[PDB]
Write an enzyme that holds these catalytic residues in place. Structure first.
Site, PDB file in Angstrom:
ATOM      1  N   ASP A  66       6.011  23.238 -12.804  1.00  0.00           N
ATOM      2  CA  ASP A  66       7.096  24.107 -12.360  1.00  0.00           C
ATOM      3  C   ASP A  66       6.494  25.470 -12.035  1.00  0.00           C
TER       4      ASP A  66
ATOM      5  N   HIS B 242      -0.752  52.698  14.733  1.00  0.00           N
ATOM      6  CA  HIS B 242      -0.711  52.350  16.141  1.00  0.00           C
ATOM      7  C   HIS B 242       0.714  52.230  16.654  1.00  0.00           C
ATOM      8  N   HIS B 243       1.699  52.353  15.770  1.00  0.00           N
ATOM      9  CA  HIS B 243       3.094  52.509  16.145  1.00  0.00           C
ATOM     10  C   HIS B 243       3.475  53.959  16.391  1.00  0.00           C
TER      11      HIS B 243
ATOM     12  N   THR C 172      -8.792  36.495  13.623  1.00  0.00           N
ATOM     13  CA  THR C 172      -7.782  35.636  14.230  1.00  0.00           C
ATOM     14  C   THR C 172      -8.409  34.693  15.248  1.00  0.00           C
TER      15      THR C 172
ATOM     16  N   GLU D 279       4.064  44.067   7.042  1.00  0.00           N
ATOM     17  CA  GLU D 279       5.222  43.176   7.098  1.00  0.00           C
ATOM     18  C   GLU D 279       5.047  42.083   8.142  1.00  0.00           C
TER      19      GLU D 279
ATOM     20  N   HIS E 217      20.531  42.451  14.820  1.00  0.00           N
ATOM     21  CA  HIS E 217      19.804  41.270  15.249  1.00  0.00           C
ATOM     22  C   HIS E 217      18.328  41.348  14.878  1.00  0.00           C
TER      23      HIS E 217
ATOM     24  N   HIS F 245       3.449  47.486   9.172  1.00  0.00           N
ATOM     25  CA  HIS F 245       2.387  46.660   9.719  1.00  0.00           C
ATOM     26  C   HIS F 245       1.902  45.570   8.759  1.00  0.00           C
TER      27      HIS F 245
ATOM     28  N   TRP G 235      16.075  48.642  14.119  1.00  0.00           N
ATOM     29  CA  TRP G 235      15.633  48.081  12.849  1.00  0.00           C
ATOM     30  C   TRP G 235      14.688  49.008  12.094  1.00  0.00           C
TER      31      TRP G 235
ATOM     32  N   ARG H 243      12.888  50.291  26.409  1.00  0.00           N
ATOM     33  CA  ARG H 243      13.529  49.506  25.366  1.00  0.00           C
ATOM     34  C   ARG H 243      14.904  50.065  25.029  1.00  0.00           C
TER      35      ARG H 243
ATOM     36  N   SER I 271      -2.514  24.844   9.747  1.00  0.00           N
ATOM     37  CA  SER I 271      -3.702  24.189   9.196  1.00  0.00           C
ATOM     38  C   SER I 271      -3.371  22.828   8.589  1.00  0.00           C
TER      39      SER I 271
ATOM     40  N   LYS J 212     -10.061  31.960  13.338  1.00  0.00           N
ATOM     41  CA  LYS J 212      -9.088  30.970  12.885  1.00  0.00           C
ATOM     42  C   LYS J 212      -8.655  30.037  14.013  1.00  0.00           C
TER      43      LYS J 212
ATOM     44  N   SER K 109      14.044  41.237  -3.745  1.00  0.00           N
ATOM     45  CA  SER K 109      13.874  39.785  -3.673  1.00  0.00           C
ATOM     46  C   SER K 109      12.428  39.416  -3.379  1.00  0.00           C
ATOM     47  N   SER K 110      11.835  40.092  -2.395  1.00  0.00           N
ATOM     48  CA  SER K 110      10.471  39.782  -1.986  1.00  0.00           C
ATOM     49  C   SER K 110       9.464  40.105  -3.084  1.00  0.00           C
TER      50      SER K 110
ATOM     51  N   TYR L 121       2.292  40.746   9.132  1.00  0.00           N
ATOM     52  CA  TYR L 121       1.308  39.784   8.667  1.00  0.00           C
ATOM     53  C   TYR L 121       1.804  38.970   7.488  1.00  0.00           C
TER      54      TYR L 121
HETATM   55  C1  HEA Z   1      11.844  36.661  14.027  1.00  0.00           C
HETATM   56  C2  HEA Z   1      11.989  37.555  14.975  1.00  0.00           C
HETATM   57  C3  HEA Z   1      12.773  37.333  16.218  1.00  0.00           C
HETATM   58  C4  HEA Z   1      13.228  36.107  16.892  1.00  0.00           C
HETATM   59  C5  HEA Z   1      13.045  34.650  16.566  1.00  0.00           C
HETATM   60  C6  HEA Z   1      13.927  36.692  18.063  1.00  0.00           C
HETATM   61  C7  HEA Z   1      14.579  35.831  19.060  1.00  0.00           C
HETATM   62  C8  HEA Z   1      15.148  36.227  20.358  1.00  0.00           C
HETATM   63  N1  HEA Z   1      15.286  37.522  20.717  1.00  0.00           N
HETATM   64 FE1  HEA Z   1      14.791  39.263  19.629  1.00  0.00          FE
HETATM   65  N2  HEA Z   1      14.234  40.966  18.508  1.00  0.00           N
HETATM   66  C9  HEA Z   1      13.521  41.023  17.367  1.00  0.00           C
HETATM   67  C10 HEA Z   1      13.001  39.830  16.697  1.00  0.00           C
HETATM   68  C11 HEA Z   1      13.253  38.432  17.062  1.00  0.00           C
HETATM   69  N3  HEA Z   1      13.934  38.042  18.149  1.00  0.00           N
HETATM   70  C12 HEA Z   1      13.273  42.374  16.819  1.00  0.00           C
HETATM   71  C13 HEA Z   1      12.522  42.764  15.581  1.00  0.00           C
HETATM   72  C14 HEA Z   1      13.941  43.250  17.781  1.00  0.00           C
HETATM   73  C15 HEA Z   1      14.023  44.760  17.757  1.00  0.00           C
HETATM   74  C16 HEA Z   1      15.434  45.285  17.557  1.00  0.00           C
HETATM   75  C17 HEA Z   1      15.379  46.787  17.608  1.00  0.00           C
HETATM   76  O1  HEA Z   1      14.670  47.337  18.469  1.00  0.00           O
HETATM   77  O2  HEA Z   1      16.048  47.425  16.774  1.00  0.00           O
HETATM   78  C18 HEA Z   1      14.479  42.268  18.754  1.00  0.00           C
HETATM   79  C19 HEA Z   1      15.255  42.664  19.919  1.00  0.00           C
HETATM   80  C20 HEA Z   1      15.436  41.794  21.067  1.00  0.00           C
HETATM   81  C21 HEA Z   1      15.427  42.316  22.446  1.00  0.00           C
HETATM   82  C22 HEA Z   1      15.193  43.730  22.900  1.00  0.00           C
HETATM   83  C23 HEA Z   1      16.564  44.383  22.944  1.00  0.00           C
HETATM   84  C24 HEA Z   1      16.457  45.807  23.396  1.00  0.00           C
HETATM   85  O3  HEA Z   1      15.345  46.359  23.382  1.00  0.00           O
HETATM   86  O4  HEA Z   1      17.493  46.374  23.778  1.00  0.00           O
HETATM   87  C25 HEA Z   1      15.704  41.132  23.264  1.00  0.00           C
HETATM   88  C26 HEA Z   1      15.759  41.172  24.743  1.00  0.00           C
HETATM   89  O5  HEA Z   1      15.885  40.170  25.408  1.00  0.00           O
HETATM   90  C27 HEA Z   1      15.845  39.975  22.345  1.00  0.00           C
HETATM   91  C28 HEA Z   1      16.160  38.607  22.742  1.00  0.00           C
HETATM   92  C29 HEA Z   1      15.813  37.433  21.951  1.00  0.00           C
HETATM   93  C30 HEA Z   1      16.051  36.077  22.473  1.00  0.00           C
HETATM   94  C31 HEA Z   1      16.636  35.688  23.802  1.00  0.00           C
HETATM   95  C32 HEA Z   1      15.600  35.226  21.368  1.00  0.00           C
HETATM   96  C33 HEA Z   1      15.603  33.743  21.359  1.00  0.00           C
HETATM   97  O6  HEA Z   1      14.344  33.241  20.902  1.00  0.00           O
HETATM   98  C34 HEA Z   1      16.763  33.205  20.530  1.00  0.00           C
HETATM   99  C35 HEA Z   1      16.361  32.675  19.156  1.00  0.00           C
HETATM  100  C36 HEA Z   1      16.002  31.205  19.220  1.00  0.00           C
HETATM  101  C37 HEA Z   1      15.308  30.614  18.236  1.00  0.00           C
HETATM  102  C38 HEA Z   1      14.970  29.159  18.332  1.00  0.00           C
HETATM  103  C39 HEA Z   1      14.877  31.382  17.013  1.00  0.00           C
HETATM  104  C40 HEA Z   1      15.838  31.051  15.876  1.00  0.00           C
HETATM  105  C41 HEA Z   1      15.090  30.300  14.809  1.00  0.00           C
HETATM  106  C42 HEA Z   1      15.629  29.319  14.075  1.00  0.00           C
HETATM  107  C43 HEA Z   1      17.053  28.892  14.273  1.00  0.00           C
HETATM  108  C44 HEA Z   1      14.742  28.650  13.049  1.00  0.00           C
HETATM  109  C45 HEA Z   1      15.405  28.547  11.684  1.00  0.00           C
HETATM  110  C46 HEA Z   1      15.553  27.083  11.346  1.00  0.00           C
HETATM  111  C47 HEA Z   1      15.336  26.596  10.116  1.00  0.00           C
HETATM  112  C48 HEA Z   1      14.924  27.490   8.987  1.00  0.00           C
HETATM  113  C49 HEA Z   1      15.507  25.131   9.872  1.00  0.00           C
HETATM  114  N4  HEA Z   1      15.774  40.374  20.936  1.00  0.00           N
HETATM  115  C1  HEA Z   2       4.277  38.073  14.062  1.00  0.00           C
HETATM  116  C2  HEA Z   2       4.184  39.383  13.988  1.00  0.00           C
HETATM  117  C3  HEA Z   2       3.079  40.144  14.622  1.00  0.00           C
HETATM  118  C4  HEA Z   2       1.646  39.839  14.684  1.00  0.00           C
HETATM  119  C5  HEA Z   2       0.837  38.693  14.140  1.00  0.00           C
HETATM  120  C6  HEA Z   2       1.151  40.999  15.459  1.00  0.00           C
HETATM  121  C7  HEA Z   2      -0.276  41.122  15.767  1.00  0.00           C
HETATM  122  C8  HEA Z   2      -0.959  42.211  16.479  1.00  0.00           C
HETATM  123  N1  HEA Z   2      -0.294  43.267  17.000  1.00  0.00           N
HETATM  124 FE1  HEA Z   2       1.777  43.679  16.947  1.00  0.00          FE
HETATM  125  N2  HEA Z   2       3.844  44.074  16.792  1.00  0.00           N
HETATM  126  C9  HEA Z   2       4.803  43.348  16.180  1.00  0.00           C
HETATM  127  C10 HEA Z   2       4.522  42.073  15.510  1.00  0.00           C
HETATM  128  C11 HEA Z   2       3.220  41.420  15.347  1.00  0.00           C
HETATM  129  N3  HEA Z   2       2.068  41.918  15.834  1.00  0.00           N
HETATM  130  C12 HEA Z   2       6.177  43.902  16.211  1.00  0.00           C
HETATM  131  C13 HEA Z   2       7.450  43.331  15.631  1.00  0.00           C
HETATM  132  C14 HEA Z   2       5.981  45.130  16.985  1.00  0.00           C
HETATM  133  C15 HEA Z   2       6.973  46.174  17.408  1.00  0.00           C
HETATM  134  C16 HEA Z   2       7.450  46.971  16.215  1.00  0.00           C
HETATM  135  C17 HEA Z   2       8.680  47.692  16.667  1.00  0.00           C
HETATM  136  O1  HEA Z   2       9.771  47.108  16.527  1.00  0.00           O
HETATM  137  O2  HEA Z   2       8.555  48.835  17.156  1.00  0.00           O
HETATM  138  C18 HEA Z   2       4.536  45.122  17.264  1.00  0.00           C
HETATM  139  C19 HEA Z   2       3.915  46.195  18.031  1.00  0.00           C
HETATM  140  C20 HEA Z   2       2.473  46.373  18.119  1.00  0.00           C
HETATM  141  C21 HEA Z   2       1.863  47.694  18.376  1.00  0.00           C
HETATM  142  C22 HEA Z   2       2.555  49.022  18.517  1.00  0.00           C
HETATM  143  C23 HEA Z   2       2.618  49.320  20.009  1.00  0.00           C
HETATM  144  C24 HEA Z   2       3.940  49.941  20.380  1.00  0.00           C
HETATM  145  O3  HEA Z   2       4.989  49.438  19.928  1.00  0.00           O
HETATM  146  O4  HEA Z   2       3.932  50.933  21.131  1.00  0.00           O
HETATM  147  C25 HEA Z   2       0.427  47.407  18.444  1.00  0.00           C
HETATM  148  C26 HEA Z   2      -0.616  48.435  18.664  1.00  0.00           C
HETATM  149  O5  HEA Z   2      -1.765  48.272  18.308  1.00  0.00           O
HETATM  150  C27 HEA Z   2       0.253  45.952  18.217  1.00  0.00           C
HETATM  151  C28 HEA Z   2      -1.024  45.248  18.252  1.00  0.00           C
HETATM  152  C29 HEA Z   2      -1.281  43.994  17.551  1.00  0.00           C
HETATM  153  C30 HEA Z   2      -2.646  43.450  17.426  1.00  0.00           C
HETATM  154  C31 HEA Z   2      -3.934  44.027  17.934  1.00  0.00           C
HETATM  155  C32 HEA Z   2      -2.434  42.207  16.685  1.00  0.00           C
HETATM  156  C33 HEA Z   2      -3.481  41.239  16.271  1.00  0.00           C
HETATM  157  O6  HEA Z   2      -3.276  40.806  14.922  1.00  0.00           O
HETATM  158  C34 HEA Z   2      -3.525  40.030  17.201  1.00  0.00           C
HETATM  159  C35 HEA Z   2      -4.942  39.471  17.242  1.00  0.00           C
HETATM  160  C36 HEA Z   2      -4.997  38.159  17.990  1.00  0.00           C
HETATM  161  C37 HEA Z   2      -5.676  38.029  19.140  1.00  0.00           C
HETATM  162  C38 HEA Z   2      -6.389  39.200  19.740  1.00  0.00           C
HETATM  163  C39 HEA Z   2      -5.704  36.699  19.854  1.00  0.00           C
HETATM  164  C40 HEA Z   2      -6.663  35.720  19.182  1.00  0.00           C
HETATM  165  C41 HEA Z   2      -8.105  36.149  19.323  1.00  0.00           C
HETATM  166  C42 HEA Z   2      -8.980  35.520  20.119  1.00  0.00           C
HETATM  167  C43 HEA Z   2      -8.571  34.327  20.927  1.00  0.00           C
HETATM  168  C44 HEA Z   2     -10.400  36.020  20.188  1.00  0.00           C
HETATM  169  C45 HEA Z   2     -10.690  36.656  21.539  1.00  0.00           C
HETATM  170  C46 HEA Z   2     -10.150  38.063  21.579  1.00  0.00           C
HETATM  171  C47 HEA Z   2     -10.907  39.096  21.975  1.00  0.00           C
HETATM  172  C48 HEA Z   2     -12.332  38.895  22.391  1.00  0.00           C
HETATM  173  C49 HEA Z   2     -10.326  40.477  22.001  1.00  0.00           C
HETATM  174  N4  HEA Z   2       1.531  45.244  18.130  1.00  0.00           N
HETATM  175 CU    CU Z   3       1.466  46.669  14.125  1.00  0.00          CU
END
Ligand code: HEA
Ligand code: HEA
Ligand code: CU
Ligand code: PC7
Ligand code: PGT
Ligand code: PTY
Ligand code: 3PH
Ligand code: 3PH
Ligand code: MG
Lengths: 74, 78, 91, 51, 90, 47, 72, 266, 504
Positions: I90, I284-285, I310, I237, I60, I235, I125, I432, I250, I313, I153-154, I239
């Site tokens: 194109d 930070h992971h 951010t 990925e 998932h 990380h 994952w 988790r 935008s 933005k 692909s990417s 972004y």
């Molecule tokens: C894109 C990233 C994404 C999205 C959308 C979701 C969506 C949801 N996820 Fe999850 N989830 C992950 C990324 C995501 N997740 C990741 C990375 C893990 C880690 C697995 C691991 O640890 O190995 C995780 C694991 C994870 C956990 C933790 C499991 C665990 O630790 O044991 C849970 C717990 O509740 C959860 C629940 C849900 C639920 C209820 C939704 C709901 O939002 C259901 C989805 C509903 C939607 C609306 C989104 C679907 C989007 C579309 C259908 C748009 C596409 C349409 C067009 C292109 C036209 N998922």
């Molecule tokens: C859409 C994907 C996405 C994005 C955009 C981000 C954005 C950020 N993430 Fe995250 N992150 C994940 C997806 C993402 N992350 C996933 C999937 C995991 C778990 C991986 C796994 O499966 O293990 C993860 C886990 C993760 C960790 C690892 C922690 C852990 O798992 O133990 C950390 C640690 O630093 C982190 C921090 C941040 C920070 C600082 C940003 C910043 O970019 C966000 C900055 C934005 C703001 C701060 C808000 C806007 C700012 C303002 C309004 C200004 C005012 C703010 C201040 C004055 C502070 N996230």
């Molecule tokens: Cu990160």
């Protein structure tokens, strides 16, 4: 009553402490080769590695010493 | 591509700080205690203790006075 | 005779005969600096190849000959490995 | 061999789990730490491990 | 025309003209079809772009405020200026 | 007057390279995909 | 003819409706004309239903498959 | 067909200098060939019968589709479909592909640097491990360095020359010097006193040098395919320049590989 | 034939969008099993099978990260919109654009086929060794080969995008006049090219450990090196998956506010600063793996600097809505909902960036709540904003406005009441990747499982929004895709449009 454990070695500063275990285990057998068997420093090294090293690691190291696969000079 | 806006230099100060910190961190690792490919490095206990204590003190000695003062928070929670 | 490449040809001019030969000589100086000597030593190496021998057996240290799974996908010994050198007796 | 320096302020029973995925039974590796006073520890508990 | 230095030779100039389109003297935009999309910038802001559609046989048309007027003309060949008339260099 | 029989890009070779391969390879990949799916699903690993 | 380099390079000069299309997608004004497919809304709903059924039923089949293997 | 060229001139060619392609079947076949070869590779890892045969069948299908695709690209390059801007697009695409491959090699050499500098207690903290005899720098690797530098200079000759005979000779010299690099690497792989299962030294050495040698082979095949197109018409266009750039990239990668593994003992 | 042999970027983008919808359906289905098992303490519908639960969460997570968001944003909207937006007739390499798509159904088939083989790939994952090495059989190899194909692909798509931007621009249009969607897609392509091959190298190392008995991550190797390489990929990925969402937000905000974007050069410098800082904060992971305190110190201090661009933005989006003439439709709500709910996910990232605080909440459901805020409110809202905005241009069908607001409100209710209690679970210490928990965690898990059903019902209602479209004639616009008809012709931009600078 007071409990005695391995002291802090300044030579090993990181959180991973496997090298401290290995160097103390090797200093024990170096002491055993050089300064007899009943010297106080050798007992200090023995209690020092016994305090740090897991028992599985130590028994693997004596089976490597008995098989001849220990890279130490002594 | 365009005129860098007055924001972009204020962005570039901590970005330059982070890049310099990254370079210094990557550079100081091959001048550290556990990066030695020999067992005969540790048989000189004076030099090895001096090197590892120097690896402890740098970037931590800036924080010793506030570690002793428990300045672990922005506010003062007792 | 009406190709696209000829149609757009006058709009993409070439950036401007003996200067080419001068550049060829300049690069061939560096070519002949390392060219013949490497070929000569490689042709010597092709004739001093699989004739020498090593009889240094290696003790079966834990980091030698890792067998986390039984064997290899092709057979027992390593690929390109005519003569295994790690002790299989140990003694 | 990762080292932790720890000092406990008060007696009690503290719970925990394992926090890194490790198989089918990752949910079922809990941690319990019992904290007692040092004089009890050095006069009663360590006498259970003298051969 | 504007100075053709630092211009690609295949860009079909008229976009490099020295004329500001007025109501009584518009800029004639050549076209291979009966309609063509062009792009006009805002005269007070370069970053703003407006795209519009010109049609054949229509009155002069302005796209941005205080901007040029444009008339489409249907032609068989559009001069790929950079080798069409500066090679003529008349 | 610019193409020889030794030439790889001969227009007389276009049927073999472009039309025959488009169906021969199209059926070979179907046959390989079905067998690979059955092999990985219903097969036993000996290593 | 039919295998010349020009057929490779410029394609085949087909004009009009292709085989079963009711609109010219290659040269017409719209590359997608979903108001000209006959019975379009039946096919669209059937295809969306099939997509929903497969996309929601593949993980259920994988759960049933793995649990039928243990229960043996 | 006779009006299809007329239609292309009237609607695409005379309006912009960019190339518009007719429909093609090779990407779909290449994708499903990757699927078949991945199933075969998974079966071949775990010693299933008829698994290596399936992997070779899938790889042969991928290679055949790639050759047919590249023959179509060369055919379109010989009917004059590619203007100068299209050729510069080809060079920029090769630059992007080269950057991707360089990051792959950086990730590969990261592991070598990490494993070599801090030997673990499992190796009894000695690098290189006892029993492993390292391959020196004062021997056949230096001959490879000289040969591949000569190949760099000979490919540099062919880029600037205008005489067709000199260009063909320089291309043949660089191809022949590349083939001498591989046949000497085969001898290193056979005479070496360690295998891929002998320590992280053996693992890192063989994986990194195998990827570099496979890139040497692919660059040599690319330069060979560029030479035969120059042999026919005395015009190569983007095939010659992109191949010379790729060969220079391989020569640059070898510098890091040699300096890290053979000199640095990592 | 048309959809199998295509060289048009508009057909390939639509194929990417349909594929991403299929992957979203699969990950919705796999996520109802996660929430239906976790609803009550004890053993649910999985009958206490922990390996099957690990397989379900691994598949998932991989599916929703790689076969839903990237094929929708980067492959779906980018391929359809980029050449029309910059005026290119194109793509630069039209057949490379078709193999960039057609390597995705093989990778999805391999990943779905690994679940039916042996006991499946239950690793997470991230697929950490030695748990990934210890798995005996074929499933893990099929999963890693699926990741390899998706990475190829990417990389191919990013190469085609980067060459299409640099060399097929309209005459007179410099790197100042392209919309922010184009700038976001270009920066995403640069990130893909710099980041994906490191993952490919780490995965090749994983296969050589599994099947060739090599010594990369093993007894005599180093297992921290895998986490270094994987998170150096991973990380960047996250972004890669959020920058096209910024571009779509935008374009949507600027459209219905009747205003251009506030601070265009600041927006571009902020996206560039986000792209550059994403490559030096990967560790930070890895706060709990035993790194030295200086390394943890740097990776703590450098992670929080990502907050500043951010925030710039977000504040510029608010300034774009400020002093405009705003009309609120369904895409405008999905953008307002994005800006509101991405801020909630971003501020928890600042908390997680601090290492001492991260020692308490690492591998808890706090992290899960953080990344489901920044991905289900950040990327899913951005995807659905573009579906209602450009849908009559892309598909040729309009949408009923009332049912779309019903779908938006059902989704907004469902995903807020699902991941907000997971903050309280993660603060209390619920770990988790577990299917059974302590008795006291029952209430918030019941609330979150109630919310997931609302999210599923919202997914169901979305299929009912489509209806027949009305077609009109365009005259003017601020971007090139709104002066075209709906749908455009097969060769959109029959004549190449030029940008004329005003004279004196
Ligand atoms: C894109 C990233 C994404 C999205 C959308 C979701 C969506 C949801 N996820 Fe999850 N989830 C992950 C990324 C995501 N997740 C990741 C990375 C893990 C880690 C697995 C691991 O640890 O190995 C995780 C694991 C994870 C956990 C933790 C499991 C665990 O630790 O044991 C849970 C717990 O509740 C959860 C629940 C849900 C639920 C209820 C939704 C709901 O939002 C259901 C989805 C509903 C939607 C609306 C989104 C679907 C989007 C579309 C259908 C748009 C596409 C349409 C067009 C292109 C036209 N998922
Ligand atoms: C859409 C994907 C996405 C994005 C955009 C981000 C954005 C950020 N993430 Fe995250 N992150 C994940 C997806 C993402 N992350 C996933 C999937 C995991 C778990 C991986 C796994 O499966 O293990 C993860 C886990 C993760 C960790 C690892 C922690 C852990 O798992 O133990 C950390 C640690 O630093 C982190 C921090 C941040 C920070 C600082 C940003 C910043 O970019 C966000 C900055 C934005 C703001 C701060 C808000 C806007 C700012 C303002 C309004 C200004 C005012 C703010 C201040 C004055 C502070 N996230
Ligand atoms: Cu990160
Ligand atoms: C082994 C030596 C090679 C360098 C290395 O990776 O060592 C570590 C050693 O640092 C530690 O973790 C401390 C233990 C000693 C350096 O820091 P990392 O945590 O890997 O992050 C820095 C980034 N970079 C890999 C590019 C150098
Ligand atoms: C098997 C896959 C082979 C793909 C070949 C390829 O990538 O080459 C393309 C160009 O590729 C590049 O630009 C360089 C990248 C090469 C990627 C090679 C894939 C290797 C995978 C590992 C050719 O462009 P096109 O097929 O769209 O035709 C263009 C036409 O001739 C004129 O427009
Ligand atoms: C999709 C991603 C790719 C996944 C597939 C990777 C499979 C790797 C197969 C390796 C098989 C050869 C390994 C091997 O032992 O051969 C070595 C050659 O190195 C090499 O050639 C290693 C590099 C392989 C790159 C492919 C030398 O053999 P040896 O070390 O046993 O010889 C020493 C005795 N003198
Ligand atoms: C099954 C999946 C259901 C869950 C997904 C929901 C979207 C699909 C159902 C929506 C139908 C709808 O809106 O109809 C109202 C729709 C019009 O509703 P109105 O706009 O309110 O008038 O009805 C039709 O267009 C009727 C067309 C013929 C219906 C029968 C033939 C097609 C059946 C497809 C449904 C799936 C059947 C089961 C699977 C068969 C194989 C695929
Ligand atoms: C490593 C693989 C690198 C493959 C690079 C292919 C580039 C394709 C290209 O430039 O197409 C336009 C290019 C046209 O160039 P022109 O000759 O200037 O028209 O198409 C080709 O046919 C290029 C030559 C392909 C040679 C086969 C590749 C051999 C690689 C080793 C196997
Ligand atoms: Mg963890």
């Amino acid at each position: 009553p007071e409990l005695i454990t391995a002291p802090y070695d300044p030579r090993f500063p990181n959180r991973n402490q496997a090298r401290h275990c290995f160097v103390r285990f090797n200093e024990y057998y170096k002491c055993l080769y050089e300064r007899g068997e009943e010297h106080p420093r050798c007992q200090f090294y023995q209690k020092a590695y016994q305090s740090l090293c897991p028992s599985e690691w130590v028994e693997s190291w004596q089976e490597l010493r008995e098989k001849g696969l220990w890279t130490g000079k002594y | 591509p365009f005129k860098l806006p007055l924001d972009a230099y204020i962005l570039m100060l901590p970005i330059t700080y982070a890049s310099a910190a990254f370079v210094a961190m990557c550079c100081r690792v091959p001048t550290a205690d556990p990066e030695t490919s020999s067992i005969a490095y540790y048989e000189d206990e004076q030099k090895s203790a001096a090197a590892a204590q120097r690896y402890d003190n740098s970037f931590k000695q800036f924080f010793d006075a506030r570690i002793r003062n428990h300045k672990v928070g922005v506010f003062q929670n007792w | 005779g009406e190709t696209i490449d000829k149609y757009w040809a006058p709009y993409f001019p070439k950036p401007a005969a003996d200067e080419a030969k001068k550049s060829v000589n300049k690069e061939m100086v560096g070519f002949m600096l390392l060219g013949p000597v490497g070929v000569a030593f490689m042709l010597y190496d092709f004739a001093v190849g699989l004739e020498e021998e090593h009889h240094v057996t290696i003790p079966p240290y834990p980091w030698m000959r890792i067998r986390r799974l039984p064997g290899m996908p092709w057979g027992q010994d390593g690929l390109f490995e005519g003569h295994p050198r790690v002790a299989t007796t140990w003694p | 061999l990762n080292q932790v320096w720890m000092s406990i302020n008060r007696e009690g029973v503290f719970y925990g789990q394992c926090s890194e995925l490790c198989g089918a039974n990752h949910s079922f590796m809990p941690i319990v730490v019992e904290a007692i006073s040092p004089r009890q520890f050095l006069t009663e508990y360590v006498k259970k491990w003298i051969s | 025309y504007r100075p053709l230095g630092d211009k690609e030779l295949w860009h079909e100039a008229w976009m490099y003209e020295d004329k500001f389109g007025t109501e009584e003297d518009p800029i004639i935009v050549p076209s291979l079809e009966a309609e063509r999309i062009i792009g006009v910038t805002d005269p007070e802001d370069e970053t703003l772009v407006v795209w519009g559609i010109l049609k054949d046989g229509e009155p002069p048309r302005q796209f941005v405020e205080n901007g040029e007027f444009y008339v489409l003309k249907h032609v068989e060949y559009i001069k790929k200026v950079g080798d069409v008339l500066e090679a003529i260099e008349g | 007057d610019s193409y020889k029989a030794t030439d790889f890009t001969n227009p007389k070779y276009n049927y073999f390279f472009r039309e025959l391969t488009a169906r021969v390879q199209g059926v070979l990949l179907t046959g390989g995909s079905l067998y690979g799916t059955w092999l990985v699903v219903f097969g036993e690993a000996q290593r | 003819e039919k295998y010349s380099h020009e057929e490779v390079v410029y394609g085949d000069g087909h004009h009009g409706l292709r085989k079963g299309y009711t609109y010219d997608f290659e040269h017409g004004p719209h590359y997608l004309q979903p108001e000209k497919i006959p019975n379009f809304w039946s096919k669209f709903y059937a295809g969306t239903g099939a997509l929903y059924a497969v996309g929601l039923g593949v993980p259920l089949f994988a759960v049933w498959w793995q649990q039928s293997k243990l229960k043996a | 067909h006779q009006t299809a060229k007329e239609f292309y001139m009237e609607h695409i060619g005379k309006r912009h200098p960019f190339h518009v392609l007719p429909p093609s079947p090779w990407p779909m076949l290449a994708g499903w060939g990757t699927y078949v070869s991945c199933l075969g590779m998974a079966a071949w890892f775990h010693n299933m019968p008829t698994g290596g045969a399936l992997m070779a069948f899938g790889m042969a299908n991928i290679a055949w589709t790639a050759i047919t695709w590249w023959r179509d690209c060369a055919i379109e390059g010989d009917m004059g479909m590619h203007t100068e801007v299209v050729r510069k697009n080809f060079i920029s695409g090769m630059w992007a592909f080269i950057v991707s491959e360089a990051l792959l090699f950086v990730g590969l050499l990261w592991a070598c640097l990490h494993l070599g500098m801090s030997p673990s207690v499992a190796l009894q903290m000695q690098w290189p491990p006892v029993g492993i005899e390292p391959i020196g720098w004062d021997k056949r690797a230096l001959v490879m360095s000289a040969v591949l530098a000569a190949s760099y200079y000979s490919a540099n000759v062919a880029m600037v020359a205008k005489d067709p005979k000199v260009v063909m000779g320089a291309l043949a010299t660089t191809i022949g010097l590349g083939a001498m690099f591989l046949a000497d690497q085969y001898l290193e792989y056979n005479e070496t006193p360690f295998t891929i299962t002998d320590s992280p030294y053996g693992t890192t050495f063989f994986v990194t040098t195998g990827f570099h040698g496979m890139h040497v082979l692919l660059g040599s095949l690319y330069l060979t395919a560029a030479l035969m197109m120059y042999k026919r018409t005395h015009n190569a266009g983007a095939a010659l320049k992109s191949s010379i750039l790729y060969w220079h990239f391989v020569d640059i990668v070898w510098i890091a590989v040699y300096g890290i593994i053979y000199v640095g003992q990592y | 034939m048309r959809w199998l042999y295509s060289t048009s970027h508009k057909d390939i983008g639509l194929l990417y969008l349909v594929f991403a919808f299929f992957g979203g359906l699969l990950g919705t289905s796999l996520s109802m099993l996660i929430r239906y098992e976790l609803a009550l303490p004890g053993r649910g519908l999985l009958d206490g099978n922990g390996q099957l639960y690990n397989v379900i969460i691994t598949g998932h997570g991989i599916i929703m990260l790689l076969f839903m968001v990237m094929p929708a944003l980067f492959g779906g909207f980018g391929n359809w919109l980029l050449p029309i937006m910059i005026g290119a007739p194109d793509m630069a390499f039209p057949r490379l654009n078709n193999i960039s798509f057609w390597l995705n159904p093989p990778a999805l088939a391999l990943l779905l086929l690994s679940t039916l083989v042996e006991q499946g790939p239950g690793t997470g994952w991230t697929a950490y060794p030695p748990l990934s090495v210890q798995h005996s059989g074929t499933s893990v190899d099929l999963a890693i080969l699926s990741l390899h194909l998706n990475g190829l692909s990417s990389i191919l798509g990013a190469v085609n995008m980067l060459v299409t931007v640099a060399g097929l621009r309209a005459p007179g249009m410099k790197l100042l006049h392209m919309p922010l969607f184009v700038w976001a897609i270009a920066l995403t392509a640069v990130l893909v090219i710099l980041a994906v091959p490191v993952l490919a190298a780490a995965l090749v190392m994983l296969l050589t450990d599994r099947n060739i008995n090599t010594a990369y991550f093993c007894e005599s190797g180093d297992l921290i090196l895998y986490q270094h390489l994987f998170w150096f990929f991973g990380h960047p990925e996250v972004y890669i998956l959020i920058l096209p969402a910024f571009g779509i937000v935008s374009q949507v905000v600027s459209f219905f506010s009747q205003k251009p974007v506030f601070g265009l050069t600041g927006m571009i410098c902020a996206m560039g600063a986000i792209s550059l800082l994403g490559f030096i904060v990967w560790a930070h992971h890895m706060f709990t793996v035993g790194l030295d305190l200086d390394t943890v110190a740097y990776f703590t201090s450098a992670t929080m600097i990502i907050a500043v661009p951010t925030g710039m933005k977000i504040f510029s989006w608010m300034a774009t809505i400020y002093s405009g003439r705003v009309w609120f439709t369904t895409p405008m709500w999905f953008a307002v909902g994005f800006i509101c709910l991405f801020t909630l996910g971003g501020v928890t990232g600042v908390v997680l960036a601090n290492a001492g605080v991260d020692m308490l909440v690492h591998d808890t459901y706090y992290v899960v709540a953080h990344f489901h805020y920044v991905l289900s409110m950040g990327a899913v809202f951005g995807i659905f904003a573009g579906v209602y905005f450009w849908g009559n241009l892309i598909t040729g069908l309009g949408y009923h406005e009332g049912r779309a607001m019903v779908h938006f409100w059902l989704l907004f209710i469902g995903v807020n009441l699902t991941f907000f209690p997971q903050h309280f679970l993660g603060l209390a210490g619920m770990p988790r990747r577990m299917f059974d928990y302590a008795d006291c965690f029952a209430g918030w898990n019941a609330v979150s499982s109630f919310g997931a059903s609302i999210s599923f019902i919202s997914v169901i209602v979305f299929a009912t929004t489509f209806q027949e479209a009305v077609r009109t004639v365009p005259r003017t616009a601020t971007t090139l895709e709104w002066v075209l008809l709906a749908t455009p012709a097969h060769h959109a931009l029959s004549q190449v449009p030029v940008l004329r600078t005003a004279s004196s």
